[PDB]
Write a protein that binds this ligand. Structure first.
Ligand SMILES: CCCCCCCCCCCCCCCCCC(=O)OC[C@H](COP(=O)([O-])OCC(O)COP(=O)([O-])OC[C@@H](COC(=O)CCCCCCCCCCCCCCCCC)OC(=O)CCCCCCCCCCCCCCCCC)OC(=O)CCCCCCCCCCCCCCCCC
Ligand SMILES: CCCCCCCCCCCCCCCCCC(=O)OC[C@H](COP(=O)([O-])OCC(O)COP(=O)([O-])OC[C@@H](COC(=O)CCCCCCCCCCCCCCCCC)OC(=O)CCCCCCCCCCCCCCCCC)OC(=O)CCCCCCCCCCCCCCCCC
Ligand SMILES: CCCCCCCCCCCCCCCCCC(=O)OC[C@H](COP(=O)([O-])OCC(O)COP(=O)([O-])OC[C@@H](COC(=O)CCCCCCCCCCCCCCCCC)OC(=O)CCCCCCCCCCCCCCCCC)OC(=O)CCCCCCCCCCCCCCCCC
Ligand SMILES: CCCCCCCCCCCCCCCCCC(=O)OC[C@H](COP(=O)([O-])OCC[N+](C)(C)C)OC(=O)CCCCCCCCCCCCCCCCC
Ligand SMILES: CCCCCCCCCCCCCCCCC[C@@H](O)O[C@H](CO[C@H](O)CCCCCCCCCCCCCCC)COP(=O)(O)OCC[N+](C)(C)C
Ligand SMILES: CCCCCCCC/C=C/CCCCCCCC(=O)OC[C@H](COP(=O)(O)OCCN)OC(=O)CCCCCCC/C=C/CCCCCCCC
Ligand SMILES: CCCCCCCC/C=C\CCCCCCCC(=O)OC[C@H](COP(=O)(O)OCCN)OC(=O)CCCCCCC/C=C/CCCCCCCC
Ligand SMILES: CCCCCCCC/C=C\CCCCCCCC(=O)OC[C@H](COP(=O)(O)OCCN)OC(=O)CCCCCCC/C=C\CCCCCCCC
Ligand SMILES: CCCCCCCC/C=C\CCCCCCCC(=O)OC[C@H](COP(=O)(O)OCCN)OC(=O)CCCCCCC/C=C\CCCCCCCC
Lengths: 174, 99, 56, 603, 459
């Protein structure tokens, strides 16, 4: 099956060389492939056809839950427990989504390395740069916040980083 | 001697009075039914039913939801040329630095 | 002998009725925390034509 | 789809199948060993098929079927790497295991727990397959510990033997030091790469550092019994001969070499770790061969030969030749398993006698065993066209033409000569001469199981290196040009060892008796390493465990500081407070003093 | 949480109104039913906890502990059946009542939503344990063990009460959600240092910490089998749960005050493993192994990284199950020969094969054989400690080596060798004992199959 997005999970086109034998001996790999197709592939295909026919008898659907956007901890007032709770939940959902984005990029990198094989150091250098950028951004955002991380702690870290950047820019162009 | 004390009794063997003892009780019927209820309830009910219940617990941790959202965001970001991961979690426009 | 069975095995309903009573008390406690029902920013929703409460 | 991954996973599954059937009347009856042997043979054929598939087009695949758990940004999943190393090592291991299982059917016939023995052998095979096909560090560690504990269980097969129990515990200790190294490597890799899988590890580690590579090297040394952690392998011969033939020499002791082969990109990137690997392998092979040349227990001689071959493999890894090490692994598995089977046949025929000083006349007493052992010793020493020629000769040529340690090269050559020497010792003291066994001759090797198993492992000691070397793609540039005296260096040193060992063995027929030398005592006593290193550290650790931690700290000073001192203080204060005599005059005077103090010093 | 709380308070009258020969059957059956009911708490969310009411809430850290307690009660009932054959009906009912009260207090402690109620229940657990030990222990040292246990716990926990009331007066509330959302940094002053010391020292004495741990061998050796099972598996985890809960308000001072406790915990792992190497008593060996594992959990909690809390939770659950199984095996061997000396009885693999298998499996799980949750937790803790510093790897490696050494040493001593000639009362293993061992061991392998349920809220 191909029930996934090709753009999200890229895969280079597959170039398979044509078989050009130079000997009169038969091919045991070809004979064993024919035997495997006759003995395994056809029965499993028939079983899957029956199962999918049974599935189509009663077809029902499930949905992807959509979450609304809420004001964040920057807009939340101090000691405003309800707004802080909403912002914290939104931040945690965003954190999980970012973790899964990093996972997607790592899967891309692993698949590209395995696919390229012996020439990975050069061919799959585009995935390495994307992974470097994503990893650096993820580290800068959710760096060592500890086991009790929170939206307030992340905001404090971002404010500290912004102050450091502003001071560096001023001392450079001043 | 210092007390009028009973001698230490010899330990009783459950297999002497009942070769088919399961070790639960000295009464044969009570022992058999204790073994049966323990085995049935514990093993069958708890192990099998709780294991399949935990296996088929609904995805309330939103792992699959997070994966789908990540796929959607990655597609939208790389389609429009935007960076996959943002530089900041919050908006510097909304953040007011002290100065 | 049916009375003797009841007179000896009536203690086997205590835990089930306790579980039922605990579920009832949990629902009754949940009904006291409906201050923000259908009022959160994330889950605020117009009620269905045949509906009065989003959750019980 | 593709019959590659399906057939590999099918081989693994059919290996796992008889373990499930161990809860049945098939396990209760006496057909279980034959059932397991048949299953292993079918697995061997079904694994030969993907090997044929690979040798055609070089197909390599990884299967990540089951997702175990996602630790935030790190995903651990059940992944298998069906690459060249896996698809080449699985059929060899299955073939050796099939032969060993038939040999064990013949050998452990009177054992009341032969079914359990075969179950343990199958479990070890499953764990070894998991280790070989593992694609991530966690699964590799699972296989590592599985083979370690299966070795522990099978070494102490006779639970009533204190020597077997202590040998098993010693093996566990050395393998646990190796596991310390392995855990260090895993922790470094996760911390500095956010991955436990080889693909991302290789992608991110363009220049692998000393800490992770030293962790890997320590794990490999612990598993392959290199110098410093070697003595567990010779002591692991307390188990049954099938265990020594299958587990240790053939498939388990090559786990460290295989681990170092799996990280050959990182090994190429680093240099200091390569030098350390080369030096460790050289010293290991030299020391183990030197200990072997003077042993009287045939199983111990074969064990030290296995250790020397492992040292040679480590040397091959240190000169940046990972694939030659794998080829040597395969060929060594073949002929070493055959040699162990022949030694076991000799031992069984002579009523559990494991002394070459009592073996003799077996050249004509046991024809087929003699032929098989001669062929195995010729393959072990590098006969110019046997299985050992296509690995050992290339290894020696690559060591000669390399920018390596001169001392390591010299020790490698001396180790080859000593290999020839101890092969000569085994042959001379076991088969030539006059009988020295008890007069009741019970020699009988006409069992079809034994004959067929040794025959199958015998055809693979002649016609397997040629096929394997001619059916693999060139993964390294050959050394075509070299001086003539360097092209035949291995043959010259082998012949020198043959001649010197034969001369020194012929000198034993003279009616001259002389006391042993310091060198002989050093070599026979295993270099004094087991004595000193098994008596001093153990005594000191077990003494400090009782004198300092248990008695001095826990039972004396930790009790003295908090609970005893407080209790004593409270007891003294209670005595002081309640020691009053109940005299109204005294405590009314105390009342007066209290009244005056309250009136004056309180404002 | 009332759906779980009320059935225990119904176990009490059922136990006291059941027939004399049906108390064990009724208690076991209904404890198993309550455990099955409590299995529903594993359906935790991903962002916030389950807030049932203003008083009780469940989290990904609380749920596995509640399930462990509800599962551990019937096993204690089976062990009590084993060792309380000749007791009178009223005393047996009192023993069952003590076990039920302890389970109820543990459930309420794990599900409490405020620190003061948590403290009240966590101190309320002392009374049933002390009564059980000092009343149904077998040897003279049970009174001393009870005194040591009670006074260590109270000396630890009273400054915690003072600190808790001070914190409530200063901030406004002790509710965990409020003190997490309204958390503010702790300045580096003497007053903050002493408040940190109060809270942490209370939970460390409960944990225990090396140097504050003698009460653990004293109480575990002299307690009956059920008392040892509940002391090692659940009561030791109150300190870990409290530390994982109380450290929210102790930052960033925890980054500065953790050094003495980290050094104590690591050197205590080493020292207690070495002590295990040379122990003449099996129960003492198991107790010191428990001390070492809890020291590792302490290290994880003190380094306080997201990879260390998951390892801490997994290791707590795994150690609880493994220690309970080990204590059950040791109690079976003791009840056969009426002595706790380890070298007294040998050849138990020849005499009892299935018990030898159970011993092998328990000792393999103790030394963290992959892919067991013991190893999962230990490996996560080791990786977090390696990130913290690069010599913790050395300490963890030597600790792991010594752990394997003493586990296999006790296995070989008890099971392998030549059987003692003059011990001729080794009867075949009972179905009750075999079922107890199986019920101890199977959940470990099932949690190995599904490990995400015991990795805490940071998963
Ligand atoms: C701290 C030191 C650290 C050293 C590190 C480096 C180590 C280097 C090792 C070198 C090789 C060691 C050989 C084995 C020594 C032990 C022998 C033994 O125990 O035998 C008993 C054992 C039989 O015991 P047994 O039958 O039970 O009965 C025992 C007797 O009852 C009683 O037995 P015994 O005791 O009467 O018989 C032993 C006797 C006889 O054995 C030998 O002679 C063995 C060596 C044979 C000659 C080797 C050199 C000659 C050939 C090469 C010449 C140069 C070629 C250059 C060109 C090459 C390329 C073309 O030897 C001696 O007495 C002394 C031998 C000294 C060897 C040198 C290394 C150790 C020196 C230690 C210092 C003290 C020495 C004095 C002794 C102690 C104090 C009293 O012997 C054997 O099984 C055979 C041993 C000989 C095998 C030789 C194989 C070939 C060796 C390499 C040749 C060169 C290859 C190419 C190299 C690279 C070229 C580029
Ligand atoms: C006595 C020798 C000694 O100092 O050994 C230190 C050594 C710890 O190694 P370390 O990391 O070098 O010591 C702390 C650093 O020097 C400096 O560490 P730092 O710079 O990171 O600052 C942390 C320091 C901040 O400094 C302070 O807080 C100083 C003011 C302390 C006030 C009094 C505390 C009273 C409660 C202590 C526990 C009583 C139980 O924390 C402490 O001083 C905490 C002291 C209590 C630690 C826990 C003791 C548990 C019982 C041990 C076994 C007893 C038998 O052993 C102990 O602390 C236990 C000694 C038991 C006798
Ligand atoms: C589950 C098994 C739990 C233990 C056995 C309990 C039952 C028992 O007594 O079996 C022996 C007994 C054998 O019959 P017997 O000859 O009368 O018994 C006499 C002796 O006891 C016979 O004892 P034995 O010494 O001849 O052998 C008994 C066996 C029993 O011992 C064991 O089974 C121990 C297993 C655990 C070791 C310690 C924990 C380490 C962490 C492992 C976590 C894996 C979780 C996987 C999921 C598990 C889900 C349940 O022990 C061994 O084989 C020695 C240890 C072998 C260790 C192998 C390597 C372990 C580490 C690597 C594992 C990798 C797996 C994942 C791979 C991922 C990548 C592909 O079995 C039965 O009679 C079975 C019938 C009833 C079975 C239950 C109902 C089945 C149908 C539903
Ligand atoms: C606060 C409580 C202090 C209790 C002091 C106490 O009674 O110590 C016992 C001790 C008496 O103990 P002792 O007399 O048994 O000491 C004998 C000690 N050995 C055996 C080692 C030689 O009292 C004092 O030292 C007097 C302390 C007075 C107050 C000092 C301040
Ligand atoms: C035979 C030799 C056995 C010993 C050696 C082991 C060798 C390997 C043996 C492997 C056997 C199992 C392989 C096949 C496993 C099939 C089941 C597995 O796939 O499901 C697991 C699930 O298993 C259960 O989750 C385990 C339950 C664990 C909890 C049981 C608790 C019972 C009560 C006891 C209380 C104990 C308290 C302890 C603290 C909690 C994993 O979860 P998942 O694949 O995704 O579920 C799929 C369903 N989906 C798709 C809808 C998600
Ligand atoms: C960092 C972790 C620790 C590293 C190692 C430090 C020393 C280890 C301390 C060991 C503690 C001792 C515990 C005692 C357990 C029981 C001991 C025991 O069973 O007896 C000794 C037992 C068996 O005695 P036998 O010799 O077989 O006698 C049989 C007679 N028929 O032998 C042993 O197991 C002791 C082995 C101790 C190992 C010490 C040597 C290890 C040092 C080498 C490390 C260097 C490796 C070099 C590789 C470097 C690669 C980069
Ligand atoms: C590219 C060309 C080279 C490709 C690689 C070729 C590898 C050739 C390996 C051997 C060929 C395959 C032989 C198939 C044997 C398995 C057949 C089988 O299942 O059993 C039949 C039959 C009887 O088995 P029993 O145990 O006695 O059962 C009796 C039942 N009443 O099996 C046999 O014994 C056949 C005899 C085998 C002859 C000896 C073959 C020795 C082969 C040496 C090299 C093999 C190395 C393995 C792979 C090499 C590459 C890594
Ligand atoms: C803190 C400033 C306030 C000053 C007062 C401090 C009060 C709190 C500290 C006291 C702790 C309470 C327990 C000690 C009370 C007195 C105990 C006592 O009497 O000690 C003697 C007592 C006599 O026992 P007998 O039954 O008479 O005979 C048998 C002899 N084996 O000796 C014992 O063996 C009893 C064991 C008691 C030890 C209890 C463990 C104490 C643990 C203290 C931990 C640190 C606490 C910190 C303060
Ligand atoms: C142990 C020996 C040392 C401890 C003896 C306890 C006697 C009290 C001595 C320390 C008192 C500390 C204190 O009072 O101040 C802490 C502070 C006071 O500050 P404020 O005045 O309110 O406002 C700031 C003013 N600018 O109050 C708090 O932080 C609340 C918590 C303080 C409780 C006291 C700390 C007790 C020490 C804990 C050690 C625990 C040891 C455990 C024993 C284990 C035995 C097995």
């Amino acid at each position: 099956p191909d029930s996934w997005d090709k753009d999200v999970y890229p895969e280079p086109p597959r170039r398979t060389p044509a078989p050009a034998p130079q000997t009169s001996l038969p091919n045991p790999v070809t004979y064993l492939t024919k035997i495997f197709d006759l003995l395994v592939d056809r029965p499993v295909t028939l079983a899957r056809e029956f199962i999918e026919q049974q599935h189509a008898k009663n077809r029902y659907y499930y949905y992807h839950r959509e979450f609304r956007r809420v004001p964040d901890i920057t807009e939340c007032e101090e000691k405003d427990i309800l707004c802080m709770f909403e912002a914290e939940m939104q931040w945690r959902r965003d954190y999980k989504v970012d973790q899964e984005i990093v996972n997607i990029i790592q899967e891309r990198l692993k698949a590209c390395q395995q696919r390229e094989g012996e020439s990975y150091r050069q061919n799959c250098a585009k995935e390495l740069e994307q992974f470097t950028q994503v990893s650096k951004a993820f580290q800068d955002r959710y760096s060592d916040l500890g086991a009790h991380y929170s939206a307030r702690k992340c905001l404090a870290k971002q404010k500290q980083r912004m102050l450091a950047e502003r001071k560096a820019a001023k001392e450079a162009a001043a | 001697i210092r007390l009028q004390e009973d001698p230490d009794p010899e330990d009783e063997n459950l297999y002497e009075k009942n070769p088919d003892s399961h070790g639960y009780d000295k009464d044969p019927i009570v022992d058999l039914w204790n073994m049966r209820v323990v085995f049935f309830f514990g093993f069958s009910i708890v192990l099998v039913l709780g294991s399949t219940f935990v296996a088929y617990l609904p995805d309330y941790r939103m792992q699959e939801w997070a994966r789908r959202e990540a796929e959607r965001l990655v597609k939208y970001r790389e389609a429009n040329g935007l960076p996959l991961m943002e530089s900041n979690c919050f908006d510097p426009n909304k953040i007011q630095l002290p100065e | 002998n049916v009375l003797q069975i009841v007179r000896d095995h009536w203690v086997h309903i205590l835990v089930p009725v306790g579980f039922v009573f605990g579920c009832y008390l949990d629902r009754r406690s949940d009904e006291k925390l409906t201050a923000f029902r259908n009022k959160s920013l994330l889950f605020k929703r117009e009620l269905r034509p045949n509906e009065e409460v989003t959750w019980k | 789809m593709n019959p590659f991954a399906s057939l590999t996973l099918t081989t693994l599954t059919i290996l796992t199948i008889p373990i499930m059937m161990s809860n049945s009347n098939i396990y209760k009856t006496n057909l279980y060993p034959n059932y397991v042997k048949t299953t292993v043979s079918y697995a061997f054929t079904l694994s030969l098929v993907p090997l044929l598939m690979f040798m055609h087009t070089g197909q390599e695949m990884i299967i990540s079927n089951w997702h175990w758990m996602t630790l935030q940004t790190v995903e651990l999943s059940l992944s298998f790497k069906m690459d060249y190393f896996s698809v080449m090592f699985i059929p060899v291991a299955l073939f050796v295991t099939w032969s060993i299982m038939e040999f064990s059917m013949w050998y452990m016939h009177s054992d009341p727990f032969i079914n359990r023995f075969f179950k343990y052998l199958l479990l070890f095979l499953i764990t070894m397959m998991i280790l070989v096909t593992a694609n991530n560090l966690f699964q590799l560690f699972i296989g590592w510990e599985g083979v370690g504990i299966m070795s522990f269980l099978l070494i102490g097969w006779w639970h009533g033997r204190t020597d077997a129990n202590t040998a098993a515990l010693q093996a566990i200790l050395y393998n646990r030091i190796g596991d310390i190294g392995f855990v260090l490597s895993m922790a470094w890799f996760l911390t500095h790469s956010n991955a436990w899988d080889l693909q991302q590890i290789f992608m991110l580690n363009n220049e692998c550092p000393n800490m992770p590579l030293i962790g890997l090297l320590l794990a490999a040394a612990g598993k392959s019994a290199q110098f410093g952690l070697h003595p567990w392998l010779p002591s692991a011969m307390e188990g049954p001969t099938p265990v020594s033939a299958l587990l240790h020499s053939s498939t388990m002791v090559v786990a460290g070499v295989f681990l170092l082969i799996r990280f050959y990109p990182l090994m190429e990137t680093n240099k200091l770790v390569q030098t350390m690997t080369l030096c460790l392998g050289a010293i290991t092979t030299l020391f183990t061969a030197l200990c072997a040349i003077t042993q009287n227990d045939i199983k111990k001689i074969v064990a030290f030969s296995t250790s020397s071959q492992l040292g040679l493999m480590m040397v091959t890894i240190g000169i940046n030749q990972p694939h030659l090490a794998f080829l040597h692994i395969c060929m060594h598995a073949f002929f070493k398993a055959m040699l162990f089977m022949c030694s076991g046949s000799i031992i069984h025929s002579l009523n559990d006698e494991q002394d070459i000083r009592k073996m003799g006349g077996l050249y004509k007493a046991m024809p087929f065993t003699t032929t098989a052992l001669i062929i195995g010793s010729l393959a072990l020493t590098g006969m110019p066209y046997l299985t050992g020629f296509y690995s050992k000769d290339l290894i020696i040529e690559a060591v000669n033409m390399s920018y390596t340690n001169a001392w390591a090269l010299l020790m490698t050559l001396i180790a080859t000569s000593l290999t020839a020497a101890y092969s000569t010792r085994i042959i001379f003291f076991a088969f030539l001469g006059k009988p020295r066994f008890p007069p009741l001759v019970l020699i009988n090797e006409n069992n079809p199981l034994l004959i067929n198993s040794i025959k199958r492992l015998l055809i693979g000691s002649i016609f397997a290196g040629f096929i394997i070397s001619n059916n693999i793609p060139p993964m390294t540039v050959p050394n075509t040009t070299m001086p003539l005296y360097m092209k035949m260096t291995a043959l010259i040193v082998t012949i020198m060892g043959f001649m010197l060992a034969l001369e020194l063995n012929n000198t034993t027929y003279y009616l001259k008796f002389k006391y042993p030398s310091q060198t002989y005592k050093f070599s026979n006593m295993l270099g004094y390493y087991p004595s000193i290193m098994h008596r001093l550290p153990t005594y000191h650790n077990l003494s400090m465990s009782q004198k300092s931690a248990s008695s001095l700290l826990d039972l004396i000073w930790l009790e003295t500081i908090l609970p005893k001192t407080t209790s004593f203080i409270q007891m003294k204060m209670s005595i002081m407070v309640s020691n009053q005599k109940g005299l109204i005059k005294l405590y009314f005077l105390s009342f007066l003093i209290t009244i005056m103090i309250s009136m004056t010093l309180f404002n | 949480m009332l759906k779980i709380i009320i059935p225990t308070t119904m176990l009490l009258p059922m136990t006291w109104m059941s027939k004399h020969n049906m108390i064990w059957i009724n208690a076991t059956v209904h404890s198993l039913l309550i455990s099955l009911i409590s299995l529903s708490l594993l359906n935790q969310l991903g962002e916030n906890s389950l807030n049932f009411s203003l008083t009780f809430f469940s989290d990904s850290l609380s749920a596995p502990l509640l399930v462990l307690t509800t599962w551990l009660l019937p096993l204690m009932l089976m062990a009590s059946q084993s060792h309380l054959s000749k007791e009178t009906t009223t005393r047996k009912k009192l023993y069952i009542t003590m076990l039920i009260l302890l389970q109820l207090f543990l459930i309420m402690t794990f599900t409490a939503t405020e620190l003061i109620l948590f403290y009240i229940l966590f101190e309320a657990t002392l009374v049933p344990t002390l009564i059980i030990i000092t009343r149904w222990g077998n040897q003279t040292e049970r009174l001393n063990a009870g005194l040591y246990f009670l006074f260590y716990t109270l000396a630890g926990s009273l400054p915690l009460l003072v600190a808790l009331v001070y914190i409530q007066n200063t901030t406004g509330s002790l509710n965990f959600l409020i003190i997490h959302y309204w958390s503010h940094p702790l300045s580096n002053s003497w007053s903050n240092i002493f408040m940190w010391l109060a809270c942490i020292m209370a939970f460390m004495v409960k944990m225990p910490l090396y140097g504050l741990h003698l009460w653990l061998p004293k109480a575990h050796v002299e307690a009956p089998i059920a008392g040892s099972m509940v002391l090692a598996a659940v009561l030791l985890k109150l300190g870990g749960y409290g530390m994982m809960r109380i450290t929210t308000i102790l930052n960033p001072l925890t980054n500065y005050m953790a050094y003495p406790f980290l050094m104590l915990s690591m050197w205590g792992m080493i020292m207690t493993s070495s002590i295990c190497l040379r122990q003449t008593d099996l129960k003492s060996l198991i107790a010191y192994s428990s001390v070492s594992h809890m020291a590792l959990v302490i290290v994880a909690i003190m380094i306080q990284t997201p990879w260390s809390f998951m390892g801490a939770t997994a290791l707590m659950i795994a150690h609880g199950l493994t220690s309970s199984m080990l204590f059950c095996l040791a109690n079976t061997n003791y009840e056969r020969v009426h002595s706790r000396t380890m070298i007294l009885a040998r050849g138990l693999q020849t005499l009892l094969p299935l018990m030898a298998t159970w011993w092998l499996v328990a000792s393999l799980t103790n030394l963290a054989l992959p892919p067991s949750i013991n190893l999962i937790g230990e490996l996560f803790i080791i990786t977090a400690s390696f990130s913290w510093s690069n010599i913790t790897i050395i300490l963890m490696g030597m600790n792991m080596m010594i752990t394997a050494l003493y586990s296999l040493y006790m296995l070989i001593t008890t099971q392998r060798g030549k059987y003692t000639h003059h011990i001729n009362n080794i009867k075949p293993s009972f179905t009750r004992e075999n079922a107890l061992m199986a019920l101890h061991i199977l959940p470990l392998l099932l949690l190995t199959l599904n490990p995400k349920m015991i990795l805490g809220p940071l998963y």
